[PDB]
């Protein structure tokens, strides 16, 4: 359209992409965080690794990317690349193979009130420990520890959307069956550093079809 | 338009006429930048004895002093610390030399912390495939001395110092491996006399 072109031209004229999006400074951003599982690829009992396909829904507010719908042709939604906007560094702590950065080539979604919604997909190699003291009539518990990497509890505050993990679009495996997948929030303090860091822990309680 | 304190301060610090990330913060000629580093281990995920490759995720905490990144705190509404991406400021290129891959490149480019007096601190996360020799005379009742060797490929001792902060690596966040047992983690600062 013609009105979306002018709004996109106005929207990114002078936008620093490494300043954090708050009107005040002591105010922390609040990032709603939810994860969805597409399929469980494999869990190697020998190498003690776990390969999953995850979609990382991240929702936060942004005081600078809000506009008036009544002056831009009634447009309310925009798609911008993830290379232009600010975006948080959600990095899983217990990784075992490869780099930690999630791939940024997918596009975001701008509501007129500033709600940025970004859904990157990723292969993740968790490093959970597994006990084979019963075999093959065993239950196994593997955790994934999502959390921000550089920002404090006073600058990024994570909030879960749901109380569990969205298995709504889950491709069935045929070897492992997922019983439940809760999700918890912790505020822990490390011995490197003097400041509090938040994280979100997703457990997975699975059973082998024997 | 309406900007933050951090946007105004970010435009003032990393200014193209005043800051350049390829010249080191030496106030004069032949001044040694004293940096200090301290390794924090997280997990022994695997020790592959046939290919002689151990895998560890470690957290090397390294800090130095950069006199270009100083600001008066009370002028900019009050901001003690400030976080900036790693590619836009100067940093020494400390990597492993005894890694099994050819990846002497730096690890992933998470942003780093700089304080009000210019104390620049950086802790990037890295899994490393270190290469150590396996003493396999006794088996499976064996000790293993496996080493990690950090060194800057670009600069040298005539340009940067490299001070060890604590003698032992900190083991406080350590989750138990269940296959191996660490008994001690001594670190040393090695320099050859008659060889600057």
């Amino acid at each position: 359209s013609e009105a979306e072109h002018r709004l996109f031209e106005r929207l990114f004229e002078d936008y620093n992409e490494i300043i954090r999006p708050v009107a005040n400074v002591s105010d922390p951003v609040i990032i709603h965080f939810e994860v969805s599982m597409s399929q469980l690829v494999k869990v190697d009992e020998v190498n003690q690794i776990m390969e999953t396909n995850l979609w990382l829904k991240q929702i936060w507010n942004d005081y600078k990317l809000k506009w008036n719908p009544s002056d831009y042709g009634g447009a309310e939604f925009m798609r911008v690349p993830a290379q232009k906007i600010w975006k948080p560094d959600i990095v899983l702590y217990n990784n075992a193979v490869g780099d930690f950065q999630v791939d940024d080539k997918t596009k975001a979604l701008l509501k007129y009130t500033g709600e940025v919604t970004w859904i990157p997909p990723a292969i993740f190699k968790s490093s959970c420990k597994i006990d084979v003291t019963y075999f093959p009539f065993d239950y196994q518990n593997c955790t994934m520890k999502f959390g921000s990497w550089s920002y404090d509890k006073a600058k990024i505050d994570l909030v879960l959307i749901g109380s569990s993990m969205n298995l709504k679009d889950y491709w069935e495996s045929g070897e492992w069956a997922i019983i439940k997948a809760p999700g918890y929030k912790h505020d822990i303090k490390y011995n490197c550093c003097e400041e509090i860091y938040p994280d979100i822990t997703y457990s997975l309680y699975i059973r082998r079809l024997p | 338009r309406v900007a933050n304190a951090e946007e105004k301060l970010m435009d003032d610090l990393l200014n193209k006429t005043r800051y350049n990330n390829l010249i080191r913060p030496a106030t004069s000629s032949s001044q040694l930048i004293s940096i200090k580093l301290q390794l924090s281990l997280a997990q022994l995920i695997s020790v592959n004895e046939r290919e002689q490759i151990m895998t560890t995720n470690v957290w090397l905490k390294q800090e130095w002093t950069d006199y270009r990144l100083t600001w008066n705190s009370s002028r900019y509404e009050g901001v003690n610390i400030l976080r900036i991406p790693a590619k836009r400021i100067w940093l020494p290129d400390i990597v492993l030399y005894n890694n099994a891959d050819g990846t002497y490149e730096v690890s992933v480019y998470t942003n780093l912390i700089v304080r009000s007096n210019g104390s620049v601190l950086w802790l990037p996360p890295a899994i490393y495939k270190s290469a150590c020799k396996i003493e396999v005379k006794y088996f499976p009742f064996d000790q293993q001395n496996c080493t990690l060797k950090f060194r800057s490929w670009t600069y040298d001792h005539t340009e940067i110092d490299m001070v060890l902060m604590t003698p032992t690596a900190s083991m406080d966040d350590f989750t138990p491996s269940g296959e191996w047992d660490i008994v001690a983690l001594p670190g040393r600062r090695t320099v050859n006399p008659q060889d600057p």
Partner: antibody
Amino acid sequence: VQLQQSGPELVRPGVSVKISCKGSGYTFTDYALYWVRQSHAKSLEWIGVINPYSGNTNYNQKFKGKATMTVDKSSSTAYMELARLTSDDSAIYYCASGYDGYPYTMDYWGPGASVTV
Amino acid sequence: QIVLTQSPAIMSASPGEKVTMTCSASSSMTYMHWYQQKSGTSPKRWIYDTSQLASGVPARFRGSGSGTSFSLTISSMEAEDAATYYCQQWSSNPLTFGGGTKLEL
């Protein structure tokens, strides 16, 4: 959509003054309030911006040590207090509410109070 | 940082005449707004984003410009078009208005 302000006031120089602006006919949050003075020569200047949902203020660098801008979420009313009044401040003061998106304009204007010092 | 200056200060025209007003800047910008104030009453939002029109505005007017020079143009002069026009920019901190152009018959 209406904005309502106070009447004209006669204040001696050296005494602080307070004027008000109360908006009705729309949701008072999610907009933002601009304060604009206008002298007798019809050359009008900008004073400050407040956000009535949080209270974050930005002043003009001419008027940083003078004006103090507050809101009140009970009655949905903003208060502006000027200090150090001199003879060069007898003007017309407007409050103006605009949307806080990329038009960044003054969508609605008040009647205007008259401060004579 | 940016101080606007209008030209001309006082001008006049007959009903049915092309009218051109200019607003100039110290440095470059891209988007600039125009407000209309009549006699006695309050101003109104009149032109935004250098080319667009507000709600209750007849479609005779046209704003155009770029760089450091902008202009408002009236094709058909109206009888009730006697007012004062201000140009203003928000692209540089702080918000500076214009000097004002008084258009009379």
